[PDB]
Amino acid sequence: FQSNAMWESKFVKEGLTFDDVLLVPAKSDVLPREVSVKTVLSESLQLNIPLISAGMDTVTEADMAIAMARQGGLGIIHKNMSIEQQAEQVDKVKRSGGLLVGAAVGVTADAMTRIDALVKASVDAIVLDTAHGHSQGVIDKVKEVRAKYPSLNIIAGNVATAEATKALIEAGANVVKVGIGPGSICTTRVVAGVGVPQLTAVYDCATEARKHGIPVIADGGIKYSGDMVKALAAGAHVVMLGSMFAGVAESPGETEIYQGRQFKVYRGMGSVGAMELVPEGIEGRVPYKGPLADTVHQLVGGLRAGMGYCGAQDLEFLRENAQFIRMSGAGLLESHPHHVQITKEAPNYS
Amino acid sequence: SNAMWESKFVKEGLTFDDVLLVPAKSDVLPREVSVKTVLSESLQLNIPLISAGMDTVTEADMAIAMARQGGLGIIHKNMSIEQQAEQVDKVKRSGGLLVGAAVGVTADAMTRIDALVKASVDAIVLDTAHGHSQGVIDKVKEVRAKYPSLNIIAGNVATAEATKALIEAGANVVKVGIGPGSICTTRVVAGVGVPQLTAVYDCATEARKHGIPVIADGGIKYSGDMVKALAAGAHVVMLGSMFAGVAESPGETEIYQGRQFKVYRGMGSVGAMEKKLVPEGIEGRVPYKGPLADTVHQLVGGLRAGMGYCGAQDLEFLRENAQFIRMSGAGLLESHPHHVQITKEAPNYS
Amino acid sequence: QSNAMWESKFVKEGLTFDDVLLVPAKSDVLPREVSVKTVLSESLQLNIPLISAGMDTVTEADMAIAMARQGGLGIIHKNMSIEQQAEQVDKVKRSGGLLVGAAVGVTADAMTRIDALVKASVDAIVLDTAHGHSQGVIDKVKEVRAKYPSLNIIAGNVATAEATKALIEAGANVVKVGIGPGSICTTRVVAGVGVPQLTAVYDCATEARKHGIPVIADGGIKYSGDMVKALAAGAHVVMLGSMFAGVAESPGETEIYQGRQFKVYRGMGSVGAMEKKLVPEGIEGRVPYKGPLADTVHQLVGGLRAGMGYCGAQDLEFLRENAQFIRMSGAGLLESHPHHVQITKEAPNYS
Amino acid sequence: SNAMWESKFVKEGLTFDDVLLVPAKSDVLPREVSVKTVLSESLQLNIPLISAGMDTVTEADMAIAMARQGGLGIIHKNMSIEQQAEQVDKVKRSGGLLVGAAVGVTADAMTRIDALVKASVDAIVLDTAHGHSQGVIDKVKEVRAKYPSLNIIAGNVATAEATKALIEAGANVVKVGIGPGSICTTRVVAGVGVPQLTAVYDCATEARKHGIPVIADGGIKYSGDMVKALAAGAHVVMLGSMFAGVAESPGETEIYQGRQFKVYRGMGSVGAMEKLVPEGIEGRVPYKGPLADTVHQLVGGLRAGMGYCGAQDLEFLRENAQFIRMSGAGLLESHPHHVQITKEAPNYS
Ligand SMILES: C=C(C)c1cccc(C(C)(C)NC(=O)Nc2ccc(Cl)c(O[C@H]3O[C@H](CO)[C@@H](O)[C@H]3O)c2)c1
Ligand SMILES: C=C(C)c1cccc(C(C)(C)NC(=O)Nc2ccc(Cl)c(O[C@H]3O[C@H](CO)[C@@H](O)[C@H]3O)c2)c1
Ligand SMILES: C=C(C)c1cccc(C(C)(C)NC(=O)Nc2ccc(Cl)c(O[C@H]3O[C@H](CO)[C@@H](O)[C@H]3O)c2)c1
Ligand SMILES: C=C(C)c1cccc(C(C)(C)NC(=O)Nc2ccc(Cl)c(O[C@H]3O[C@H](CO)[C@@H](O)[C@H]3O)c2)c1
Ligand SMILES: O=c1[nH]cnc2c1ncn2[C@@H]1O[C@H](COP(=O)(O)O)[C@@H](O)[C@H]1O
Ligand SMILES: O=c1[nH]cnc2c1ncn2[C@@H]1O[C@H](COP(=O)(O)O)[C@@H](O)[C@H]1O
Ligand SMILES: O=c1[nH]cnc2c1ncn2[C@@H]1O[C@H](COP(=O)(O)O)[C@@H](O)[C@H]1O
Ligand SMILES: O=c1[nH]cnc2c1ncn2[C@@H]1O[C@H](COP(=O)(O)O)[C@@H](O)[C@H]1O
Ligand SMILES: [K+]
Numbered sequence A: 001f002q003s004n005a006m007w008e009s010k011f012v013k014e015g016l017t018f019d020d021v022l023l024v025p026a027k028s029d030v031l032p033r034e035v036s037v038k039t040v041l042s043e044s045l046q047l048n049i050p051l052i053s054a055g056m057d058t059v060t061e062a063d064m065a066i067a068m069a070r071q072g073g074l075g076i077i078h079k080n081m082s083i084e085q086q087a088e089q090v091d092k093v094k095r096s097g098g099l100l101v102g103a104a105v106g107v108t109a110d111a112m113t114r115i116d117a118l119v120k121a122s123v124d125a126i127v128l129d130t131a132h133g134h135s136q137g138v139i140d141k142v143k144e145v146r147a148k149y150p151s152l153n154i155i156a157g158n159v160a161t162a163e164a165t166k167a168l169i170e171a172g173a174n175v176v177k178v179g180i181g182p183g184s185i186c187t188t189r190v191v192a193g194v195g196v197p198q199l200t201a202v203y204d205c206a207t208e209a210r211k212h213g214i215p216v217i218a219d220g221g222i223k224y225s226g227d228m229v230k231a232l233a234a235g236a237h238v239v240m241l242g243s244m245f246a247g248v249a250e251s252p253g254e255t256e257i258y259q260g261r262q263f264k265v266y267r268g269m270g271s272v273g274a275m276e277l278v279p280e281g282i283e284g285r286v287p288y289k290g291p292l293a294d295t296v297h298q299l300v301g302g303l304r305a306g307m308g309y310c311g312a313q314d315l316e317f318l319r320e321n322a323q324f325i326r327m328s329g330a331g332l333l334e335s336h337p338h339h340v341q342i343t344k345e346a347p348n349y350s
Numbered sequence B: 001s002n003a004m005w006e007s008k009f010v011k012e013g014l015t016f017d018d019v020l021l022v023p024a025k026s027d028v029l030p031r032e033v034s035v036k037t038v039l040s041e042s043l044q045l046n047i048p049l050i051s052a053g054m055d056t057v058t059e060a061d062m063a064i065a066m067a068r069q070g071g072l073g074i075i076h077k078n079m080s081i082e083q084q085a086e087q088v089d090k091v092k093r094s095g096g097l098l099v100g101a102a103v104g105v106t107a108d109a110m111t112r113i114d115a116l117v118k119a120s121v122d123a124i125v126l127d128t129a130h131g132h133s134q135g136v137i138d139k140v141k142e143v144r145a146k147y148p149s150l151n152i153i154a155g156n157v158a159t160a161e162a163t164k165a166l167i168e169a170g171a172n173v174v175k176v177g178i179g180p181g182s183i184c185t186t187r188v189v190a191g192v193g194v195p196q197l198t199a200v201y202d203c204a205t206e207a208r209k210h211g212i213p214v215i216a217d218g219g220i221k222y223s224g225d226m227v228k229a230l231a232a233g234a235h236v237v238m239l240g241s242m243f244a245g246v247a248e249s250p251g252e253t254e255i256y257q258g259r260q261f262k263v264y265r266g267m268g269s270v271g272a273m274e275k276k277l278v279p280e281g282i283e284g285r286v287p288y289k290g291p292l293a294d295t296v297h298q299l300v301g302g303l304r305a306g307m308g309y310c311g312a313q314d315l316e317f318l319r320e321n322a323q324f325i326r327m328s329g330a331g332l333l334e335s336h337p338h339h340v341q342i343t344k345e346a347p348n349y350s
Numbered sequence C: 001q002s003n004a005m006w007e008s009k010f011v012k013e014g015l016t017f018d019d020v021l022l023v024p025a026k027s028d029v030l031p032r033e034v035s036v037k038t039v040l041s042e043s044l045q046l047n048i049p050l051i052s053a054g055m056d057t058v059t060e061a062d063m064a065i066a067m068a069r070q071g072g073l074g075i076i077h078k079n080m081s082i083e084q085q086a087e088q089v090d091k092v093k094r095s096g097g098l099l100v101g102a103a104v105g106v107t108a109d110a111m112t113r114i115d116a117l118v119k120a121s122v123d124a125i126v127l128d129t130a131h132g133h134s135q136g137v138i139d140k141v142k143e144v145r146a147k148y149p150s151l152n153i154i155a156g157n158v159a160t161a162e163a164t165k166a167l168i169e170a171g172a173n174v175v176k177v178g179i180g181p182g183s184i185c186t187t188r189v190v191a192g193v194g195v196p197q198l199t200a201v202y203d204c205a206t207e208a209r210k211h212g213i214p215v216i217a218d219g220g221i222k223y224s225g226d227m228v229k230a231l232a233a234g235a236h237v238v239m240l241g242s243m244f245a246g247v248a249e250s251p252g253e254t255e256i257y258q259g260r261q262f263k264v265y266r267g268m269g270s271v272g273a274m275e276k277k278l279v280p281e282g283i284e285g286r287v288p289y290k291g292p293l294a295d296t297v298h299q300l301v302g303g304l305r306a307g308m309g310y311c312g313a314q315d316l317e318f319l320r321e322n323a324q325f326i327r328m329s330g331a332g333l334l335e336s337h338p339h340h341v342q343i344t345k346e347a348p349n350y351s
Numbered sequence D: 001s002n003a004m005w006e007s008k009f010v011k012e013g014l015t016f017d018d019v020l021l022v023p024a025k026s027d028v029l030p031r032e033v034s035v036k037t038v039l040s041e042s043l044q045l046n047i048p049l050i051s052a053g054m055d056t057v058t059e060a061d062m063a064i065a066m067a068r069q070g071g072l073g074i075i076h077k078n079m080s081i082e083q084q085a086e087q088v089d090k091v092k093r094s095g096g097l098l099v100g101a102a103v104g105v106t107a108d109a110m111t112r113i114d115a116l117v118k119a120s121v122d123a124i125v126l127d128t129a130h131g132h133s134q135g136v137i138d139k140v141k142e143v144r145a146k147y148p149s150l151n152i153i154a155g156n157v158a159t160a161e162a163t164k165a166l167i168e169a170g171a172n173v174v175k176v177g178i179g180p181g182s183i184c185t186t187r188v189v190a191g192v193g194v195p196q197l198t199a200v201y202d203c204a205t206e207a208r209k210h211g212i213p214v215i216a217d218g219g220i221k222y223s224g225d226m227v228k229a230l231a232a233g234a235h236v237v238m239l240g241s242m243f244a245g246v247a248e249s250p251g252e253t254e255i256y257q258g259r260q261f262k263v264y265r266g267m268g269s270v271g272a273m274e275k276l277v278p279e280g281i282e283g284r285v286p287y288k289g290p291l292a293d294t295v296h297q298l299v300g301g302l303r304a305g306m307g308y309c310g311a312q313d314l315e316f317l318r319e320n321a322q323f324i325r326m327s328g329a330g331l332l333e334s335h336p337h338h339v340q341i342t343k344e345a346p347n348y349s
C-alpha cells in the first residue's frame, strides 16, 4: 500500500539543456569544408542538411518550403488552413522541380481526411503534431495512418521520454520528434509545469530510438547555430527551428518596423491569436533577416566548424563519438562575448 | 556529540523553478481529468484552491466568489471578533457555501473561535509565523478538545517534525510554507526557511503516513507552480498574490501611472500590523485582474493541461505517480519564452 | 612520486549567506525573551553581538559610544595619528566607562601605537591585516601577548582552520574571519583569493571551538538574516561595515543626491583611504542615510530574535551548537526575497 | 559500443568565476615575491604576461613596450611577410628585446617563418582555432626539423590529448584556450569549448609530465583571473582585451558618449578577415593610457595573490596553490555589492 517507490524517486532525475554544456574538442583530420552534413531519415526521405522549418503559421508555407528544400532541407506546411488550401500548398512545392515537402496534421476527427488530400499532392512526410505526443489519441492515430499508408513517412510528436519514443515507434511512426517546453515562444512549462530540459530529452529519446534504428528530431529551444551542433551530438538526426527562421524573407508575413529596424511576427501555435483557451505560447516579433540562404549559410557554417572541432567527418560520427562537458552559469558567461561593447552585429551573433 | 555540528550544511532544498514535471503516458484529455479534492469529510473542494487569509485577499466577497468557483476562502482576522463572524454568516447564509476563518495564538483565541463556531465556520485557520512552537501545539490541543468535529487547519510548518507535532496536537490539515510568499521577507530578515517544493514534499511525506492532507501556501507565481505543488504532495494550494488583484478581493482599485492596481501587503508588514515593529513582509501593489472567474479559469486550465501531460486522471494519481526532473538556471531560462520580443501579454503570462 | 597538492587543487567547496537558509525547529521560546548576550573573553562581554568595523567611514568616537551603549562594540580605525587614536579611545572610556577597541596594523610603530592605546585603557586591540595568516602578524601577536598578558587581542583576518590555529597559538584570544566578502572589497577580484564567508566562519569556528576561543564573522552581511546565519555557523559575534556606514553616528556628513541622503563608504584598501603606483583592494562609494544608530540596531537585534525564535534557541550558544541549514539554488534565493509584486513602501529592514 | 554513448555527459568544467584561491601561510612580503618565469632556456620573462597576436593588440610599439615591462608581444600575422619581418626587426633593434610572431597553417607558412627567423624572432606562435588537427601537427613537425632551436608555441588547444600531440609534434610551449576570449564566439556558433580554468589544468597536467610550459590564453577580465590561471598550472598568461585599450596598442582612439575608446575585435571576426562564417565579434574598449600603468596593476595583483597564497615564486604557486569552489552567490559576494560605486579604481571598473 505504502510500498510506493515512486514517492521517494520524484526528485531523482537531472536534466541538461544547451546552455549547460560545451562540446569537448577532439583530434581532427578533416576540414569544415570537407565534412558531410547529409542525413538519412527513411528509405524515402533524406536531407542534404539536417534542418527543418517548423509547421507554424508564422514560419513555413510554400514559399518557405520551396526555399528550404532548395537549401537541402525540409519545410513542414502548417495546418491552420483548410484541407483544400494545405493540399494546394504541397503540390506547389512538388511541381517546382521535384522538391521534398512535409505537412502538419493534428489528432482530430477529420485528420485522416486531411491526410488523404495530402497524399494526393505527393507529400513526402506528414507530421502528426500534438502538444502531448505521449497520448493514446496520438498512438491510435499513428496506427490508423500506418494501416492505410504503409509506405508513408510518419513524423510523430511531441515527446520527451524514452518510454514515449518506444510507444510512438511501436505504433508505426518512422521518425520521432522531441521537445516538450523548450520553444522560444512556448509557455507550456510555466503554465502546466511540465517538461524535460531539451538536451536531456534528445539524449534520452535517441537512446531508445537508437535500439530501433529510428531517427529523432530535436524541435525547439535552439537559439544559436552552436545549439544545433549540440543537439545533433546529443543523438538527434535533425533539428527543427522556429524562431531562427521566422524573420526570414520567405516565411509568411510581411515586415514591420519596430525600434527602427525591420521585424516579422513570430507566435506560438498554442498562443491566443494563433488559435483564432488556456494558451501555452505567446505572440511576438523576431528581427528581419533577409533571404533564407544567408541564415542557412551561417547555420551550416557553424555546424561545419563544430564538426571540424570534434574531428567528425559525418554526422553519424558526431552522434556516436562527440563528448560534452558541463558548465555553470559562469561557464556560459565566459562562453559568450563578455566585457566588451559590441560595435557591429555579426551574421552569427545578434 | 559533534553530530549537530557536522550536519549543519548537509540538507538540500528545491523550489518551483528548480524542477519540471516529467511527461508520462496519458489516456486522458484535459477536459476529462478530475480536479476535486477532499480535505476532510466535511470539507471537500471541487477545485484545489484556497484564497489566502490576508486583509488584501479574502473578505466575505472573496470567500463567496471562491466558494462558487469550487474553492475556499479564509476570512482574515484583522477585524473585530464579531465582524469576522458576520462575514462568516454572510457566506454561510449565501447559499450554504464553505468558508474558513483565520485565528491567531492569542489570549482571545477561544472567544473568537467560539464566535466563529456559532456562525457555522467550516474550518478555522490557526495562522502563525512558526507552527512548530509549543504555543501553537498547546492551542491546537485546546481547540480540538472543545470542538472534536471542527476542521482545524494549523501552520505554518516546513519540516516533517513540525507536521508530525501538529498532527498529534489534533490538526486535520497542516499548512506548509516558511518564507516563500511573494510579499514575504522572513528568510531575509530572520535567515530562516525551507524552499517551498522541498518543504511541501518533506511535510507531505510525514502527513501521508497519517492520512492527513497538506496545503502548499505561498510562492506560486504561475499556474504551473500549482501543478508542481500538488505533484509534490500537497492536496490543495493557497494563493495570495494570484488573487489579490481580482474584483472580489478587499480594497478599491489604485491608479498608478494611468493603470489599475490593488494594494497587496504581507500580514507581517508595517502597514498591516498597525491595524517598535520588526516586520517580516512588505507592502506593494499588483495589477487589477478583473473578476475572479477568469483567474480561476486560467489556473484550473493550466492544472488540467498539466495533469494530461502527466497522465493524471485525478489529483491522487498526480500526488503518488508524478515524477520531477531537476534543472539548472539555464534550464529555467529555456522554460520561459526567450529570445523573442513579446508583443501582447497572454491571459496566463504577464 | 606524489602529486597530492596537484590533484587536490579543485576539491573543496564553499558556501555563503545567499546559498543557505536556517531550518526552523521546535521552539518553546518567544523572540522577546531570548538572550543575545555573548562572552568573547573574561574581560570583554557584549550585550548584543554587533561590532562596528574599524574603518574611517564607520567607527570613530561617537560611533563606538553609541555602539557600546547598545551593548555592542566599536573598533576605532588606525587612519589617524597615534595621539589622535588614543584621544578617541580616551573619549569613549571617559564617556561612562564604555568598552572600546582600536585597530592596529603590523608595523614598526605598532608597539608604540599599542602602548598609547593601552595607556588610554582600551579594551581590545584589533591586530588588523589583509592576510592574517602571515609571519609578521603571528610574531606581532606573540610580541604583544608577552608585553600585555591580560590584554584582549583580536587578530585577523583569516579564512582557514589552519590560520585560526596559528593565530591562537600565537596568543590572540579572539579570531576575526573574513577574506574578501566585504561590500566594498575587491581582494577576491584583484587578487583571486578568498573563502565564501559562511564556509570560512564554519571552518574557523570548527578549529577555534577546540581551544574555547570565539571568532568574529566579519563582512558580507547585507541583511539582518545574514547575521543570524553567521552566528549559526559558529561565530560568537559579527562585524559590520556597510550596514552601519549610513548611520548618524558614523563619521562623515550627509550628501543629497536625487532627493535622498547618502554617506561615503570606502574600503580601507581603496585609493582614497591610502591617500590620507598603488594597487588597491577596495572601492569608494555611498550607502543610504539611515538616521540614528538605535534604529538600525533595533532591526538587527529584532531580526536575530525572530531567527532564534524560529530555531528554538533561547541563547546564542544553543544557536551555535544546534542550528541547521539547508542549501538552496539561485532559484531558492529569488523565492526567498520578495518577488513578483511591485514594492511600494520601504521597509525598516528591507531596502 | 555504449561506452562513448554513456560517457557523453560525464565531464565537468570550471572557469575563473567558479573558484577562489585558499589563502595559505605566508612568510613572504608581496614586494619580495618573484614573478620571473622560464618558458625555455632561450626565452625568459621577468613577468608572466604576453600580449596576444591580434591586429588590435600587438604591433611594434606594443611588443617593445611589453618587453620593456618584462613581458612579450606576439606580432600579429595580418600583414605581409615583409611587413611582419620588418616589425620583428624593429623590436630587436630596440635594445635586443624579445619578440614573438604569429604564423598560420598555410601553404606560404614556411616562407613567412624563414623571414621571421632572419629577423631574429625569439618565438613563433603557430596560432590556429583548432590546434588539435593534423594540419597543425604536420606544420609543427616540419618546422621543428628545419629550425631545431626555434621556440615553437603551438595552439590553440584545450585537452590533455591535444597537448600531448602538440608536444610530440615538437612544440616547446603549448597555448591553451578554445572559446574563453572576450571577443570570441566559437562556443556559441560552433558549440565547442572547455571552461578555461579546467582546460589550463587539464593541459598543464599533461604538459608537466614532459617539463613543458603552457600559456593560459584568453578569458582574463581581472588580474585575479591571471593569478587563478597560474595557480591552475599555466606558466604565463596571454591577454587581448586587457591590453587593447593602452596607448601602445595598434591604431588610434575613438570618442563615444563622451569617453575615449579603442577598437577591439577578434581575429575571426568579419572585419579582421576582410561568405565568411565568423567566430568573433567587433567592438570597443575603454582607453587606458600607457601600458606601464595597466601592467603595474596586473603585476601588483599577482604579487598580492601570491602573498596571500604564501607563494614566494611562481613555481610554488603552480605546485601548491589550492582552490575552493563557489556558486553565483559566492561570485556576487566576491565582487563589490550593495554599495553604489562613486570612483573608478585602477584595477576595478
Ligand atoms: C505545442 C503546443 C504545446 C500546443 C499547440 C497548440 C495548442 C496547444 C494547446 C494550448 C491547445 N494545448 C494543449 O493541447 N495541451 C494539451 C495538454 C495535455 C494533453 Cl494530454 C493534450 O492533449 C493530448 O491528447 C490529445 C489526444 O491524445 C492530443 O491533442 C494530445 O495533445 C493537450 C498546445
Ligand atoms: C506569517 C508571518 C510570518 C507573520 C505574520 C504576521 C506577523 C509576523 C511578525 C513580523 C510579527 N513576526 C512574527 O510573529 N514572528 C515570529 C518569529 C518567531 C517566533 Cl518563535 C514567533 O512566535 C511563535 O511562537 C509564538 C507562541 O506559539 C507564536 O506567536 C508563533 O508565531 C513569531 C509574521
Ligand atoms: C582589507 C584589506 C584587504 C586591505 C586593507 C588595507 C590595505 C590593503 C592593501 C590594498 C594595501 N592590500 C594589501 O595589503 N594586501 C596584502 C596582500 C597580501 C599580503 Cl601577504 C599582505 O601582507 C600581509 O603581510 C603583512 C604582515 O607580514 C601584513 O601587511 C599582511 O596583510 C597584504 C588591503
Ligand atoms: C581564434 C579563432 C578561433 C579564429 C581566428 C581566425 C579565424 C577563425 C575562423 C572564423 C576562420 N574559424 C576557423 O578557422 N574555424 C575552424 C574550425 C574548425 C577547424 Cl578543424 C579549423 O581548422 C583547423 O584545421 C586547419 C588545418 O590545420 C587549421 O587551420 C585548424 O584550425 C578552423 C577563427
Ligand atoms: O504555442 C506553442 N506552444 C508550445 N510549443 C510551441 C508552440 N508553437 C510552436 N511550438 C514548438 O516550438 C518549436 C519552435 O521553437 P523555436 O525554434 O525555439 O522557436 C516548434 O517546432 C514547436 O515544436
Ligand atoms: O507578511 C507576511 N510575512 C511572511 N509571510 C506572509 C506574510 N503575509 C502572508 N504571508 C504568507 O505568505 C503567503 C503569500 O502567498 P503568495 O503571495 O502566493 O506567495 C501567505 O499565504 C502566507 O502564508
Ligand atoms: O578596502 C578593503 N579591502 C578589503 N576588505 C576590506 C577593506 N576595508 C574593509 N574591509 C573588510 O570589509 C569589512 C566590512 O564589510 P561589509 O560589512 O560587508 O561592508 C571590514 O570589517 C573589513 O573586514
Ligand atoms: O576572433 C576570434 N575568435 C575566437 N578567439 C579569438 C579570436 N581572436 C582572438 N581570439 C582568442 O582570444 C584571445 C584573447 O581573449 P581575451 O584576452 O579574453 O580578450 C586570443 O589570445 C586568442 O586566443
Ligand atoms: K567567449
Ligand SMILES: [K+]
Binding pocket: A181, A182, A183, A184, A185, A186, A187, B334, B335, B336, B337, B338
Ligand atoms: K520555453
Ligand SMILES: [K+]
Binding pocket: B179, B180, B181, B182, B183, B184, B185, B186, C335, C336, C337, C338, C339
Ligand atoms: K519571499
Ligand SMILES: [K+]
Binding pocket: C180, C181, C182, C183, C184, C185, C186, C187, C188, D333, D334, D335, D336, D337
Ligand atoms: K567583495
